[PDB]
Design a protein around this ligand. Structure first.
Ligand code: CL
Ligand code: CL
Ligand code: MG
Ligand code: MG
Ligand code: MG
Ligand code: MG
Ligand code: MG
Ligand code: MG
Ligand code: MG
Ligand code: MG
Lengths: 6, 236, 236, 6
């Protein structure tokens, strides 16, 4: 899973 | 609506208490009630709305992935037949997740987006619209999948066009939009090269504009830039 | 009940899936449905019921503490008046927590306890009854507080009497009961010396019986003994 | 908070 905006 | 009798300011106050108590379902219900008062949201209120629903749908997405993996293993050769329960429960979680996405999209359509004229609010809401269509796309398997993907793409693209015209390359909303659109390209649209190009270009243009920022703005922007870098390291 | 149409075995299966997905509210609803089928529960099923409700009420208790602390600070001298919202939201969370405790106590009363004849099931359920009265006592402030505390005490005491007669001192149910009754003495009943004495005696009697155990049983018992030791270190 | 049974 890529990091999306936290 | 069960929040119709509560003052707007009280709903906001309780959303902040719910955040402190890590009661994100309550937080989301309070913020939905606040939106339904019909007034535009301030910057702080938009970020309360976003945090609340991100945490709710984040838990559903994590649960859906666990159940989907179990279901996929149940459909290997040599796997013993265990009945309909795994599919049924995965469908239950999926339907709830879709319900939350539809709720958010409904708030954006009635009437947050149409009243948002400043770039900071309009880009924020269009980014949200892309995000919640993206979460729908993660679980979509049927004849509307292509249209769900195109709805996410279209919302992100409109947000990108505004952000490039109206915001500096270091603006955290612009950066977070580009981050999430790159994830869309990689994880949803089967376009890893587009994802990489967008992340690299976004990072490099922000780098070149950091010199204009205060120390606090620099911290805000570099935090999101690090997520772009983390993804580029994962992807290349 | 919304689970009345689902097979008992399917409810059990889905409770285990819900645990894997960290969907503890769903887990608790599935296990409530399984109890309401009217058959006795196996050891594994009792521990599914306990895990589910412990996690649900654990989140509520943590949220209640956050809100109660905020409310108490609002009532310091020099604190600005902020209206009824903190009290209202703390009351909302409190009422939900009480509802979950009442649900568990209702399952125990109708009819888990009265059908439980073996020591392992009867002690387990009486320990649960003490636990959920203890959670009610944590939030109680009115004219029934003393009776809620006495209900917890009475359930724990009955469980203790059975456990001492029918179980070895290393049995994990016996150990966990003694651990929780000691916490009751310290945190609810204003009896820190009783809490310390119970924890020490329980630990020492288990120590002396470890030589009878297999490696796997030794691991089970020493894990709970370490919690008793952790509390004694905190308390002395 | 004392540890109760996990
Ligand atoms: Cl289901
Ligand atoms: Cl409330
Ligand atoms: Mg008003
Ligand atoms: Mg089955
Ligand atoms: Mg406007
Ligand atoms: Mg501008
Ligand atoms: Mg049947
Ligand atoms: Mg107020
Ligand atoms: Mg029986
Ligand atoms: Mg025995």
């Amino acid at each position: 899973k890529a990091k999306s905006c936290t | 609506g069960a929040m119709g009798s509560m003052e707007r300011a009280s709903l906001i106050q309780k959303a902040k208490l719910a955040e402190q108590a890590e009661r994100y379902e309550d937080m989301a219900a309070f913020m939905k009630g606040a939106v339904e008062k019909g007034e535009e949201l301030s910057n702080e209120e938009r970020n309360l709305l976003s945090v609340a629903y991100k945490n709710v749908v984040g838990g559903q997405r994590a649960a859906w992935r666990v159940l989907s993996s179990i279901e996929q293993k149940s459909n290997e050769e040599g796997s013993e037949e265990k009945g309909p329960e795994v599919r049924e429960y995965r469908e239950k979680v999926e339907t709830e997740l879709q319900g939350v996405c539809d709720t958010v999209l409904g708030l954006l359509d009635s009437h947050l987006i149409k009243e948002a004229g400043d770039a900071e609010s309009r880009v924020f809401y269009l980014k949200m619209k892309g995000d919640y269509y993206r979460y729908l796309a993660e679980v979509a398997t049927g004849d509307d999948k292509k249209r769900i993907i195109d709805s996410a793409r279209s919302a992100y693209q409109e947000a990108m066009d505004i952000s490039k015209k109206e915001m500096p390359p270091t603006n955290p909303i612009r950066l977070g939009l580009a981050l999430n659109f790159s994830v869309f390209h990689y994880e949803i649209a089967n376009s890893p090269e587009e994802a990489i190009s967008l992340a690299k270009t976004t990072f490099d243009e922000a780098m070149a504009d950091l010199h204009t920022l205060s120390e606090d703005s620099y911290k805000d922007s570099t935090l999101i830039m690090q997520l772009l870098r983390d993804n580029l390291t994962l992807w290349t």
